[PDB]
RNA sequence: AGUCUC
RNA sequence: AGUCUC
């Protein structure tokens, strides 16, 4: 039973748009598809997003059928230049199994700590195959797990890192053919 | 006088059963041009589309039965003379997203067979399209995206007179489906890896042509500013260090007319190509018979003193690499009366009695395969 | 590694086998207009064409198996309310030449079933398309001309609200085919005759409506300056005199709402309709239950003192006819609350313990049936 | 008739709901031996042979070999009004969604359906449609996976 | 035993009245009937309340007899425009089995964290039938579970989301005939 | 006989 | 392992 303490894997890093224009609207939104490996963003500005090709990130994108628990950790690193007394920002986090607006939320959080905060919670994959689930498959109208954010005042709550930890019971089967993963720099 | 409709056996939920003729569901004819080159995709489509060509005896059963328990069995057929050769691969994968890679490395991890028609003129393969369980169905195959790629791994050694055609007969097998799942932090024994190690080419002549294949196989296969990746290789990359009895499957992908004795052994990256006593290390000599195309090498874990890194920084040099390598070199010479290099393909099949330590944070990128 | 194609079970010559769902070969939908009248041909075609509609589970087996040993089984289906009725017939014959007759008499001697959907809402029939042997095949059915006629023997008693449709499911049966041949000068026991005796109509009222059916059944059925003829009746015509236990099958071809008690007995042609003691002769009283449509009468040969002529000169009068007759008359009255005559169909099914004398030179022509 | 029976029955901009259906909606995926109770709600004088089977939403009405799937033929006697159909869980390869987005099309629905069609014809001498009522009575040897966050709304029943 | 990690169900969303007039009074009040499914509000302005037709929300409204535990999570998402240093708002939460002013409180909390906070606690249904309880039935003078809020400065502590989680021992019996639940949008 | 029904 | 071969 392979295991080691304190070793998560980086999954994504979303940087709020630098040219966000407060005057148009005050918040902006992005969503991370935890099991499919994609990041979605606003047309609110030029987002700087990135999905790291870490071991867990590569595994999930290529594992056809999944089942079991995963651990999620979100770390918001904000604008250190704002004085603590002028902090006027908050971010709403949502866990939904689909991006469709017709699906209710599995969970919901709202974080507003100044400069930085972290959020850790587990998610579990349950599917119809044999408890296995295929990412957004049309088969039994399967689904995924999306983590959506509504950042209010993107100039203070600027950065988000999403890390994932695999559990002892995570189990997969089958392979999904994917195009080459692009290596940065 | 009145028949009782209810008593009729019209709702029989049983799986298809019978002889091969009775269980034949489809037939595909794949075209193989005389000028095919290797890397060439002969046909890449949804499996459901291959299983749906032609109205054979069990064709409407395939379409009208909700659960099929037999595996899918295919019988590929095509013969070519001994003075030529080509290596074909028929690969099966659970799903596909976008313009996925068709490289032999990416496609051969689930259920895939590589054969050389100059040696094997009829090839059979059976598989379970649903690894999580013991049954499948045509709807499941369609809505799930189960994929099939038939590619040419190595082109013709000598081109045929005319164009060729490979015929594949598809059947529902009598053997039942069995699941194959991977518990990431708890590998089974043996661990089924199915990682392509590379395509080795040894040009005709007296040259040694030393080949070095790193055993730090985590992180996928390198590509141009990208990495290729398949599921089993992805799970092995989760661990930090590993060891095990390694089993390689070596295939002759070239014509039976190009002879060569290859020598395999384990050694470190820093040895010069001209090291005289490479063969003082435990080694194995491989020669193929005319019609023989597959050989299985098994490297015991006593060839390894310690577990090694699952992943090494891609730019690491041969001098600074501290992980073992699988070497391959020419023992005598690569000779023939027709032009062409002697080419073999190496695939790390399973790892037995494996032992892994720690979790891997990950290293960015990976080295290119052969 | 090489598969041996020869060892594969691709040449399985076995007959189709399985559940009814697995042995379903075709499905025909016959149209039945609400204004259909009787004598009307719903569909007359080659049997091969009925067995070839739709791609069901055993459809390609039907087409790709050289010998089928199971009988052909059909399940007809259609229900109508009790306040109406219609008599349909589905007949099978070995072959056909030219614009053959479709009269119920001509078509019902081989394998034929007559039913009334108001009584029987699901009807099954199994038969062997090859009477000489124990197997058949689709090619044989096509090149041989095996025929199927679905006709309406009696029109609607009361017309439905809308048009109707009869659905026939065709299956390869699990029961094996068995031959049925006729040795002309050496009849078997029982002798299967299947001769239509006529369609009897008894109009509503207190009338007796005496019906006289001659038992000198040789020479076919009369037509306008012609004779109709079927094989079994043709063989019985070869003999000069005959006797036997006669078995009749009486069918209610009209709606369950038209009630009537019919009285059957054997007597000679010369009795007046008003003979008071007709019922002093051995007789049998027939009444049908709402949903009952078939009754079987059996006349023992002790109702006959001697064998009688197989054929009598057609113009022979009731007074000069010396052969027995099967009489049928109303015992009480034909009553109903809806309009329509009470109509029954009589069919001489088999002759048991028959005894025939001499060969028949033949008499020209024959009397018209009911 | 869709088997993604969670979320209640549709109504005009509303959903109808009862307790047992409400509990089944708590789960994400399910399977089981389904037992239906079919009732003849019309006069004994309107005859019709109905054919029941399991298939997917995307088949055309005129699919000739619907009856190549395992099916059951139903006919009622004059005085018979109830019939019980039982669909074994081997008619299902996998568990399916308990709830599907209401606007999902027949082409995009990946969950099984209970089909019902006329095998021969609907005939009578009096006017009126042949009408039957179908009720999913019990689910045996059921098996459910996961908890359902919920989808808003639901499709209208027959 | 059906179960999945981190999957709650949305029950209600109460938005403080936009036209609240500070000058009349400084606070406003609303109450959520956890088991009956209703929301009650002030005459302090135009409230924007909503009960989601999620699975748990539909189950509770229609289950005649209830028994067992439920998990409650309240998330307050406030006015991000207020600088943290100007935060001057707090909300008092109360758990009572009845809205009557004569019933004492089962529990009480007061939250004042700037911009946002969350509150999680379990509630348990115990009744006279067989440990089963019917919503506010006159029968044994049964009752319910109400979560009441007194929002001080509704312009800062503006939004409230109530999520519910069902437990392994929750058990119901019987059906309550209800009128159709209205689907929004 | 067969077919059918049971 | 599985598949294959025998």
From Swiss-Prot, chains B, C:
Site (Interaction with the viral RNA): 17
Entry superkingdom: Viruses
Cell compartments where the protein resides: Virion
Quaternary data: Interacts with the small capsid protein. Homomultimer; assembles as pentons. Interacts with the movement protein (via C-terminus).
Domain comment quoted from the record: Contains a beta-sheet structure called beta-barrel jelly roll.
Function of the molecule: Together with the mature small capsid protein, forms an icosahedral capsid (T=3) enclosing the viral positive strand RNA genome, with a diameter of approximately 300 Angstroms. The capsid is formed from 60 copies each of the large and the mature small capsid protein. The large capsid protein interacts with the viral RNA.
Name of the protein described by the UniProt record: Large capsid protein
Whole-protein coverage range: 447 to 816 of 1018
